[PDB]
Amino acid sequence: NAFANLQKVGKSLMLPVSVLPIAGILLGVGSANFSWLPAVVSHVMAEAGGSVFANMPLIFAIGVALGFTNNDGVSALAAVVAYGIMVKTMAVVAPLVLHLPAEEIASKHLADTGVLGGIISGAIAAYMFNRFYRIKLPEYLGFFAGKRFVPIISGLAAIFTGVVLSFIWPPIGSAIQTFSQWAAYQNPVVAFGIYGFIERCLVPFGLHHIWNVPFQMQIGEYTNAAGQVFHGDIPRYMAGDPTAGKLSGGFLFKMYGLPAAAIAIWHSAKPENRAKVGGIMISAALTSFLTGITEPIEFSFMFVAPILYIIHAILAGLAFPICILLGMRDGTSFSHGLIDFIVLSGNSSKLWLFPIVGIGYAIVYYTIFRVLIKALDLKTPGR
Amino acid sequence: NAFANLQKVGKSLMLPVSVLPIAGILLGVGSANFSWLPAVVSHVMAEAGGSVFANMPLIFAIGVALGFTNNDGVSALAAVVAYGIMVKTMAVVAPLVLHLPAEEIASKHLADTGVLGGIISGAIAAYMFNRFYRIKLPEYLGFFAGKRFVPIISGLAAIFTGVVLSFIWPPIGSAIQTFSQWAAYQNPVVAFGIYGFIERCLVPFGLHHIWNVPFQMQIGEYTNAAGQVFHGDIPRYMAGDPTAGKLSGGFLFKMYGLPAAAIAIWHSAKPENRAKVGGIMISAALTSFLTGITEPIEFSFMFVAPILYIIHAILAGLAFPICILLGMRDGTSFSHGLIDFIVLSGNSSKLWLFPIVGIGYAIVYYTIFRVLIKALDLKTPGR
Ligand SMILES: CCCCCCCCCCCCO[C@@H]1O[C@H](CO)[C@@H](O[C@H]2O[C@H](CO)[C@@H](O)[C@H](O)[C@H]2O)[C@H](O)[C@H]1O
Ligand SMILES: CCCCCCCCCCCCO[C@@H]1O[C@H](CO)[C@@H](O[C@H]2O[C@H](CO)[C@@H](O)[C@H](O)[C@H]2O)[C@H](O)[C@H]1O
Ligand SMILES: CCCCCCCCCCCCO[C@@H]1O[C@H](CO)[C@@H](O[C@H]2O[C@H](CO)[C@@H](O)[C@H](O)[C@H]2O)[C@H](O)[C@H]1O
Ligand SMILES: CCCCCCCCCCCCO[C@@H]1O[C@H](CO)[C@@H](O[C@H]2O[C@H](CO)[C@@H](O)[C@H](O)[C@H]2O)[C@H](O)[C@H]1O
């Protein structure tokens, strides 16, 4: 029965995913504070995009409520009512549990559950909906029967949940903090190898946008000489943090490996279909190379030849270790195409190695794909 | 075609209504800070109930989105995404438009649209859903087609809406402020006569909970000698404001008029049915008298004899003028039954007039109902 629940989990997370790229474009274009775009336009874009990121816990609460109730809007209302009661209950009870002043909890974020408290608030709303959406009350309460009971009981259950989270949360929030320091500073080779492999595994579903947020915007901290504080690999690299640039492995497979795989898919098509397939693969190899958008190459083989995608996910994972071990760094602000590679080159290290390790990634992806497509008779484009 | 839209308006507001009474019980029992109930329990109840009131704009945005999209949860998500972008856009643009520092706007609430910005954010989400929920994109954007486009375009439209509200809002927020001062201090006789009549008109639908919030919790301001600031007739009366107690008209029709109407409904039933009807009406007359809950008497005649309900709504309106003109004051914390009348009597004025004007309300409601039920042959309980 677990597969029918993994469908509901995926469905619940695709609502949050649907607003991440527009928020990232608004916050990116706005916070860049360009000279050619006016001051008020930049601030409105930054505060609009930053609003969608600040609402992420509530967006997750709604996605989980809708994904487990067959998209009923009263569950989304019940999740919004539950989340606000639960966050407020933790602010009252966490000071008592921790033995620290409420201003220390609030200023150090010691009781901040983030998206996890959103997921729990959605799980309350979904459970209360499926058990009570058909409840019959006595006639003196008949105006509040059925679906109208669900927000009320979700709010009452959010009190008890916020009390329990005030006891359970401190060892969880501590473990989340030690993971961030481990991934940024103690073993970035292992951490970013796991990030690249799991990101590839989530791309077929579009779920990688959620996985990218912590590594891009939350892992590690930097303060510059002006006292500005920066979190996550992307802001810390543009801020000039010498220990940023852990995401640089993306240039190897997005500029060299996947473009080379596209030519290996083209060269292995049947002759009658080889000319027609070539234009799809060129178009797709130039999109990956220039802009770092990879799905028109990935989706061309991913479903009909899953073994090529497992090899690609391994080689895309191993790309992040290689850059960290060789000491080759460069930034991204959108994705690892030639545009980000040239634009963000000012803070870079050993930039001349990306061509040299890249021709290795091109030889490896090309020769894997040509050999396996013939040998296994994989039904890639044109066969 | 307007009636099919008034159904959608009512349906959209009954979602917000469904969470008002639990929030009022939590905030009331919590903020009372009783000695018999422990300190942490009081604070958790107060902050839980206060959270549902603070979320009212967002709860209205969801109710309007769901009420105009046939309850689709992606419209509730789009309303949550729109509301947060629109509030943030006004915080950036209102300083520029007004020519005042952003800290003056934020501290004086000059750009705070309240529930009206919630309703607009829901109207964006509903419009964008009904125009775009079936949109077909080119294949490179196919993962974001259909319903997944609706939150994105609602967020983009929330930017332009927040810019327009930054120009349109200042003369609206000013008019809302002058209405509050008019209703509290300049013509409370006319204002609370309109409040009682319109409240009765909304009771058949349960919509009176929304109408009661501004008069009970937002009209007028009081500062006591300890410097605590209180808003709305209920908090200001318990705080000891000499100009509070405008809601005291409820004791006349809830303790005397409606109990008397219940005996007039009983006495006019056919003899075979008169004994059976008596117990419903006694039960219902004691519920109104003790606790100020009035629907078991109102709903007994309201649909089958609407003329009696129009007369009742007029007499319930006229009850608030009578108390303000005679200078008879008393508080409510739940509703105008004997419990609130005895409990809140300490801050009262001319308390001995409620029995004297009440026996007038009893004679008027009894004699209207007995005469009209016979004369018009109204099919009230037992006929
Ligand atoms: C697909 C299965 C696996 C996926 C899940 C694994 C990863 C866990 C999800 C990550 C949680 C996202 O968490 C959310 O991120 C954004 C962006 O950082 C934060 O946003 C915060 O920083 C951004 C700037 O970066 C501000 O614009 C925003 O105002 C702020 O509050 C949210 O406050 C946080 O709640
Ligand atoms: C459409 C252009 C808009 C202007 C962009 C320039 C503004 C600067 C800030 C933009 C931030 C974009 O944010 C970034 O987007 C890229 C591409 O979508 C995402 O990257 C991911 O998306 C695409 C498909 O969705 C994949 O092929 C790609 O391999 C994967 O890495 C990231 O998860 C995010 O880091
Ligand atoms: C049925 C048709 C006619 C009905 C509509 C006519 C009346 C207009 C609707 C009133 C709007 C309610 O507005 C909403 O009220 C509550 C309670 O005051 C406010 O709540 C505010 O005060 C309460 C205490 O009273 C706090 O607990 C809360 O933290 C706070 O932010 C909301 O911040 C405000 O947004
Ligand atoms: C169930 C008892 C719970 C304990 C109550 C004591 C705690 C003190 C704070 C309670 C606040 C209740 O809030 C108050 O509720 C009453 C009764 O619901 C409402 O009053 C309205 O509701 C009922 C029906 O719904 C009507 O018959 C009544 O005529 C009408 O005035 C008010 O709009 C609100 O002012």
Numbering used by the authors:
A (entry chain A), B (entry chain B): 4 to 386
Question: What is the paper's account of this structure, in its own sentences?
Answer:
The phosphotransferase system glucose-specific transporter IICBGlc serves as a central nutrient uptake system in bacteria. Furthermore, IICGlc consists of a transport (TD) and a scaffold domain, with the latter being involved in dimer formation.
The high-resolution cryo-EM map reveals the detergent micelle-embedded dimeric transporter, consisting of two identical IICGlc protomers that form a homodimeric complex. The absence of pronounced cryo-EM density in both the 2D projections and the 3D reconstructions suggests a linker-mediated flexibility of the IIBGlc domain, which may have hindered the determination of the complete structure of the IICBGlc protein. In contrast, the TD of the current structure is positioned within the membrane plane, representing an intermediate state between IF and OF. Its maltose head group, which is a glucose disaccharide, is specifically bound via the foremost glucopyranosyl moiety, i.e., the glucose unit more distant relative to the alkyl tail. Specifically, E298 interacts with OH-4 and OH-6 (OH-6 is additionally coordinated by H211), T297 with OH-3 and OH-4, R203 with OH-3 and both K257 and E202 engage with hydrogen bonds with OH-2, while the OR is in contact with H212. In a broader context, the loop between TM7 and α3 is shifted by several angstroms in the DDM bound state, and especially the prominent phenyl group of F337 appears considerably displaced. Indeed, while the maltose head group competitively occupies the substrate-binding site, the bulky alkyl tail of DDM partially wraps around the phenyl group of F337, interacts hydrophobically with residues from the SD and displaces the entire TM7-α3 loop, thereby preventing the full occlusion of the thin gate.
